[PDB]
Design a binder for this molecule. Structure first.
Ligand SMILES: *[C@@H]1O[C@H](CO)[C@@H](O)[C@H](O)[C@H]1NC(C)=O
Ligand SMILES: *[C@@H]1O[C@H](CO)[C@@H](O)[C@H](O)[C@H]1NC(C)=O
Ligand SMILES: [Ca+2]
Ligand SMILES: [Ca+2]
Ligand SMILES: [Ca+2]
Ligand SMILES: [Ca+2]
Ligand SMILES: [Ca+2]
Ligand SMILES: [Ca+2]
Lengths: 277, 277
């Protein structure tokens, strides 16, 4: 559908000769998705007038008026292109030439050259939001993203969900924490921790260093959910910014599930588990 | 033939797990003509050894060995990629992974991402030669060139030949010169000047300000030829760096042809023609 590259040349009527009066002309340049248009002038010589009302070349991209060019050299109220480069917003750019009823001097019009180039969606905005969560990979006509080690790309193909499940503890004591603790825990992750001991023991849980899981002031914990499910009962969900109290379970088996939503920079939780008999 | 964009992912055997011993592997990435390949690593952790003889990832583009990467962080004799970006020479790039018989530590190998990007043939080399004579226009997978006003693109589609022919002088006196005089005259141009007066007059030719047409020390004027053809005889070809003597023709018609080759920065000639009866 777009097998050939997009480029070309635009000229005022009669170029390189003098352009006429009462002329109205336009070119609509379109590129494939993922591309934008780059336009520049090899030649520009038009009638100068206030706000370029008489003769002009107008570059519009969508509803935006990218440029209104007149004259030979720019003023405080008029712009001439010179060696400037004009980039379309999106894969289309419209160029309109208009001339009024008269020319005092024999103005020779314009010559411009355009070409489609790739958009780099992985650009470093130095202040704005970036497409993908971890690694951004740009290619001609598109982009895609990937994640660091320990993650898999979410269904939305941008978020990096943590490989947080899979941990099984058979030891008498130990530590388990939210992913990347004490650094902010990842987004859209479903982490399941298992603790399985022999039939004689009971497991004790201690929230130890810092607790900070996203919380709403009215609804309690609709964003990120830390639940503790044993054999006797279940505990939670836990949310907030202070250490939850000690949990003396009467069981030898306990599963801790921790789910996260798509936003937040909360630093998470850490649990030291012990056991007695 | 190349309807889809070129991009992809490369990993060491077993990534993200430990890579094995006695492994030999390679990927040959190819882009369409006009494109080159851009490769970078999201992950790199290999065995360090002198000149990366034991384990390595080698980037070769043609006969050139672009890189030989080992270890975690670079040394005086070994290189590790880090965040560096590697560009192929031409539309192909080969990547070779090799591992020897043993690994002391559990090295986790590499992850790399590549994509085809356009070559900008119109680049500003800041010292080298530029593709086209006047204006260079880059597009995806290629380039083309154009000329200033007064020129047409030569058959070779790079050189700008001057629209130098077409001038006819009916006046009693006047000036004709090589194109762009006193600036160096263009290349591969065939310029014909005509001087046509009434039957009663004879035309006088004066080489006036400066003469500088390309000349060979043995063969006289095989590069650029300035010939003067009247009704009685012909004069020339003229070449060299000094003003030719006055030419009193006995005719009312004279054609001056001036042809140029594909190189040279010689400033040209200027002729003031007069006439009497
Ligand atoms: C504009 O570009 C041309 C080359 O295409 C160059 O000769 C000229 O110097 C440039 N003008 C400026 C102000 O850089
Ligand atoms: C390498 O790139 C990553 C982003 O992909 C960035 O986090 C890291 O700081 C970069 N390293 C350096 C030394 O710039
Ligand atoms: Ca006008
Ligand atoms: Ca892109
Ligand atoms: Ca959250
Ligand atoms: Ca090894
Ligand atoms: Ca190109
Ligand atoms: Ca020459």
């Amino acid at each position: 559908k777009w097998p050939e590259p997009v480029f070309g040349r635009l000229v005022s009527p009669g170029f390189p000769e003098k352009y006429g009066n009462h002329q109205d002309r336009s070119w609509t340049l379109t590129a494939p998705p993922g591309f934008r248009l780059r336009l520049y002038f090899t030649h520009f010589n038009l009638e100068l007038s206030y706000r370029c009302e008489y003769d002009f070349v107008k570059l519009t991209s969508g509803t935006k008026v990218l440029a209104t060019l007149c004259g030979q050299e720019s003023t405080d109220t008029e712009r001439a292109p010179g060696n400037d480069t004009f980039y379309s917003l999106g894969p289309s750019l419209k160029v309109t030439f208009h001339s009024d009823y008269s020319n005092e001097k024999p103005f020779t019009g314009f010559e411009a050259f355009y070409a489609a180039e790739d958009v780099d969606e992985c650009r470093t905005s130095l202040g704005d939001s970036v497409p993908c969560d971890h690694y951004c990979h740009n290619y001609l006509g598109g982009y895609y993203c990937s994640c660091r080690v320990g993650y898999i790309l979410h269904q939305n193909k941008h978020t990096c969900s943590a490989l947080c499940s899979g941990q099984v503890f058979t030891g008498r004591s130990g530590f388990l924490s939210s992913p990347e603790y004490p650094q902010p825990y990842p987004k859209l992750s479903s982490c399941a921790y298992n603790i399985r001991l022999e039939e004689g023991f009971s497991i004790t849980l201690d929230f130890v260093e810092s607790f900070d899981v996203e919380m709403h002031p009215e609804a309690q914990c609709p964003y990120d959910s830390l639940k503790i499910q044993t054999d006797k009962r279940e505990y939670g969900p836990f949310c907030g910014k202070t250490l939850p109290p000690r949990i003396e379970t009467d069981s030898n088996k306990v599963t801790i599930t921790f789910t996260t939503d798509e936003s937040g920079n909360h630093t998470g939780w850490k649990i030291h588990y012990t056991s007695t008999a």
